[PDB]
Write an enzyme that holds these catalytic residues in place. Structure first.
Site, PDB file in Angstrom:
ATOM      1  N   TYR B   8       0.814  -1.230   0.000  1.00  0.00           N
ATOM      2  CA  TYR B   8       0.000   0.000   0.000  1.00  0.00           C
ATOM      3  C   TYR B   8       0.841   1.270   0.000  1.00  0.00           C
ATOM      4  O   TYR B   8       0.504   2.279   0.636  1.00  0.00           O
ATOM      5  CB  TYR B   8      -1.034  -0.007   1.142  1.00  0.00           C
ATOM      6  CG  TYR B   8      -2.274   0.824   0.866  1.00  0.00           C
ATOM      7  CD1 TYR B   8      -3.148   0.478  -0.170  1.00  0.00           C
ATOM      8  CD2 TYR B   8      -2.572   1.954   1.636  1.00  0.00           C
ATOM      9  CE1 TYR B   8      -4.276   1.237  -0.437  1.00  0.00           C
ATOM     10  CE2 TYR B   8      -3.713   2.716   1.387  1.00  0.00           C
ATOM     11  CZ  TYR B   8      -4.553   2.355   0.347  1.00  0.00           C
ATOM     12  OH  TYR B   8      -5.679   3.086   0.072  1.00  0.00           O
ATOM     13  N   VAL B  11       1.769   2.734  -5.477  1.00  0.00           N
ATOM     14  CA  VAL B  11       1.091   1.861  -6.447  1.00  0.00           C
ATOM     15  C   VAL B  11      -0.245   1.312  -5.900  1.00  0.00           C
ATOM     16  O   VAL B  11      -1.271   1.393  -6.580  1.00  0.00           O
ATOM     17  CB  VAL B  11       1.969   0.708  -6.983  1.00  0.00           C
ATOM     18  CG1 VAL B  11       1.171  -0.083  -8.014  1.00  0.00           C
ATOM     19  CG2 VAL B  11       3.256   1.234  -7.609  1.00  0.00           C
ATOM     20  N   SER B  73       3.401  -4.943  -3.814  1.00  0.00           N
ATOM     21  CA  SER B  73       4.439  -4.696  -2.802  1.00  0.00           C
ATOM     22  C   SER B  73       5.792  -4.546  -3.496  1.00  0.00           C
ATOM     23  O   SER B  73       5.927  -4.940  -4.655  1.00  0.00           O
ATOM     24  CB  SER B  73       4.467  -5.826  -1.776  1.00  0.00           C
ATOM     25  OG  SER B  73       4.850  -7.072  -2.374  1.00  0.00           O
ATOM     26  N   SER B  74       6.791  -3.990  -2.807  1.00  0.00           N
ATOM     27  CA  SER B  74       8.093  -3.734  -3.445  1.00  0.00           C
ATOM     28  C   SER B  74       8.919  -4.999  -3.666  1.00  0.00           C
ATOM     29  O   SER B  74       8.833  -5.966  -2.895  1.00  0.00           O
ATOM     30  CB  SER B  74       8.880  -2.616  -2.749  1.00  0.00           C
ATOM     31  OG  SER B  74       8.965  -2.813  -1.362  1.00  0.00           O
ATOM     32  N   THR B 100       2.447  -6.739  -9.736  1.00  0.00           N
ATOM     33  CA  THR B 100       3.377  -5.753 -10.288  1.00  0.00           C
ATOM     34  C   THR B 100       4.777  -5.970  -9.694  1.00  0.00           C
ATOM     35  O   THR B 100       5.693  -5.218  -9.988  1.00  0.00           O
ATOM     36  CB  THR B 100       2.917  -4.279 -10.087  1.00  0.00           C
ATOM     37  OG1 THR B 100       2.846  -3.972  -8.692  1.00  0.00           O
ATOM     38  CG2 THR B 100       1.559  -4.013 -10.746  1.00  0.00           C
ATOM     39  N   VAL B 129       6.348  -5.388 -16.255  1.00  0.00           N
ATOM     40  CA  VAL B 129       7.165  -4.906 -17.368  1.00  0.00           C
ATOM     41  C   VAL B 129       6.485  -3.725 -18.019  1.00  0.00           C
ATOM     42  O   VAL B 129       5.399  -3.860 -18.555  1.00  0.00           O
ATOM     43  CB  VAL B 129       7.449  -5.976 -18.460  1.00  0.00           C
ATOM     44  CG1 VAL B 129       8.536  -5.451 -19.389  1.00  0.00           C
ATOM     45  CG2 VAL B 129       7.870  -7.309 -17.866  1.00  0.00           C
ATOM     46  N   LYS B 191      13.168  -7.092 -15.678  1.00  0.00           N
ATOM     47  CA  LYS B 191      12.169  -6.948 -16.746  1.00  0.00           C
ATOM     48  C   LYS B 191      12.469  -7.836 -17.962  1.00  0.00           C
ATOM     49  O   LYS B 191      11.587  -8.530 -18.453  1.00  0.00           O
ATOM     50  CB  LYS B 191      12.016  -5.482 -17.141  1.00  0.00           C
ATOM     51  CG  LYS B 191      11.161  -4.680 -16.164  1.00  0.00           C
ATOM     52  CD  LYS B 191      11.371  -3.192 -16.359  1.00  0.00           C
ATOM     53  CE  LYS B 191      10.600  -2.378 -15.337  1.00  0.00           C
ATOM     54  NZ  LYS B 191      11.153  -1.003 -15.199  1.00  0.00           N
ATOM     55  N   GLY B 272       5.542   4.324 -13.120  1.00  0.00           N
ATOM     56  CA  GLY B 272       4.917   5.322 -12.249  1.00  0.00           C
ATOM     57  C   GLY B 272       3.822   4.641 -11.449  1.00  0.00           C
ATOM     58  O   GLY B 272       3.388   3.547 -11.823  1.00  0.00           O
TER      59      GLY B 272
END
Ligand SMILES: [Mg+2]
Ligand SMILES: [Mg+2]
EC number: 1.1.1.3
Lengths: 304, 292
Positions: B8, B11, B73-74, B100, B129, B191, B272
């Site tokens: 959270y 993104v 999440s990162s 993501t 990607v 990626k 972004g």
């Protein structure tokens, strides 16, 4: 899965070939019930066209009862016929349509899609814009984006011509070279007078923006060698909420379209989230047939 | 359909906002069962994160029993955890994944996807990607074609810094100018690994990518990611004026897919929070339509 194939020049033959190359398992049950051209009806799936019966597309449709019509016939911009009334009747019968024929969607998009929407019938139409380069089908994978403006090079033949003209070949010589190569017909009017580009932007404004437009609403010009001194010219097609047009313009080196050359095409889609650009071949019969095949497999996956 | 939102930051905030924007009829029945961060579990759909319970993504998975895990999440590039074992437990329960998070897929693609294929579970992974610019989902609308090679610019930042260098504004100043708007080529490497697994079928992980980032005194150079059946790499390359990537400057990504039929290229904004969240949202709608 029974197909009626309407048209059989180069795109039609290329389509038949791709289909028989078994590039997908979704295509195992696909049969060609018939192929219809100016020379009659062939009720068989063969590489070369030999008519079995006299008759037009309506007769073929009634006799074959296909599940899908694959329309690869030439665009008739006067009134979209016989494809336009053929699509209306097929949709009412619950027959799916896959088309590369621009004219009916350029003339009667809303009439076609409303009726298709009301009967739950699916229309593949990737092949109408930028051939096998996802354009219609790109938008399908951008659900929930609101399109603000579109801009691009939408005609392979005039791009190849204006590319050669930038290289010191004359309009006339670039014309004859596009014809020798097959990109342009013996009568290249639809390309060089810009009908084709205008048809494509009409379809895109309809599908992506949601403008209720026909080719009549499009202010367009084609190409002729009264074009700017020392510029790279591109036939630019534009549409937003308010206007839709096609005109040949001077392109600057910073423009992402400057180097879209030869038969290459490009589309810049500006949405509420992002501005994207896609580029690929705008002409070539294999390319166009692949657009139709892409629609076919998507239809089979129930993804149209 | 019940979602568990994992992550959270920007993104995940952007995804929750997009979801309630009434963007598609497919999203009318979608509810957020809970949101998980490193501070705990909120079992509620709200704009602000406040923990209802302590505990990690595994406890939240058990407490919510969602239909879909949305992972924003990162990236944990050490080992892909907790997302990688989360995904395995998810698939085994018939829970779909929309992600993501590059790391699990970049480190263990075949392991995740073999499991999903055998269990019939769909994975949305567009946002890993080029964020919201169809890449993964571009290839979805290219059925029945064989991908021979991929090429592109898979990191906006490094691309932007390189842009100024050739232009005149050399390495020292360009480095500092970049930070004002806010390098080893790692991010492009993850990626390209994902793209190579999905489009080529090479069973690559991140460790297989020969990657090098930008140097001080580069003698128009671009950071180029590439893959085929043989190799996967990221090298800074002086790029020819004839390249369709030559004009791809600024904070932009671009991807050249070369198939047996044709060579196509797509370009969009790099990465972004809204873009990334839009990729996950696109996958959600696609999944609802059964088109993954
Ligand atoms: Mg027969
Ligand atoms: Mg009429």
């Amino acid at each position: 899965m029974k197909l009626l194939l309407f048209g059989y020049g180069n795109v039609g033959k290329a389509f038949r070939k791709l289909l028989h190359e078994k590039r997908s398992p979704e295509l195992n049950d696909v049969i060609i019930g018939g192929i219809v051209t100016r020379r009659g009806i062939m009720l068989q799936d063969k590489e070369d066209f030999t008519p079995d019966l006299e008759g037009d597309v309506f007769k073929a449709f009634e006799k074959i009862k296909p599940d899908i019509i694959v329309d690869v016939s030439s665009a008739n911009y006067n009134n979209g016929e016989p494809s336009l009334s053929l699509y209306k009747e097929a949709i009412k019968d619950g027959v799916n349509i896959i088309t590369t024929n621009k004219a009916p969607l350029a003339l009667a998009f809303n009439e076609i899609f409303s009726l298709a929407r009301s009967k739950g019938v699916k229309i593949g139409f990737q092949g109408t814009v930028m051939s096998g380069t996802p354009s219609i089908n790109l938008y399908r994978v951008l659900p929930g984006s609101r399109v603000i403006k579109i801009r691009g090079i939408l005609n392979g033949t005039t791009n190849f011509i204006l590319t050669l003209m930038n290289k010191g070949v004359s309009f006339e010589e670039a014309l004859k070279e596009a014809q020798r190569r097959g990109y342009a017909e013996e009568d290249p009017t639809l390309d060089i007078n810009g009908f084709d580009a205008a048809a494509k932007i009409t379809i895109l404004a309809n599908f992506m923006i949601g403008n209720s437009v026909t080719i009549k609403d499009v202010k367009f010009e084609g190409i002729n060698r009264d074009l700017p001194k020392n510029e790279k010219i591109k036939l630019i097609a534009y549409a937003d909420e308010k206007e839709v047009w096609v005109k040949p313009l001077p392109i600057s080196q910073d423009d992402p379209l400057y180097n879209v050359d030869g038969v290459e095409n490009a589309l810049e889609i500006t949405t509420d989230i992002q501005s994207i650009l896609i580029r690929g071949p705008g002409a070539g019969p294999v390319n166009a047939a692949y657009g139709a095949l892409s629609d076919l497999i998507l239809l089979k996956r129930d993804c149209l």
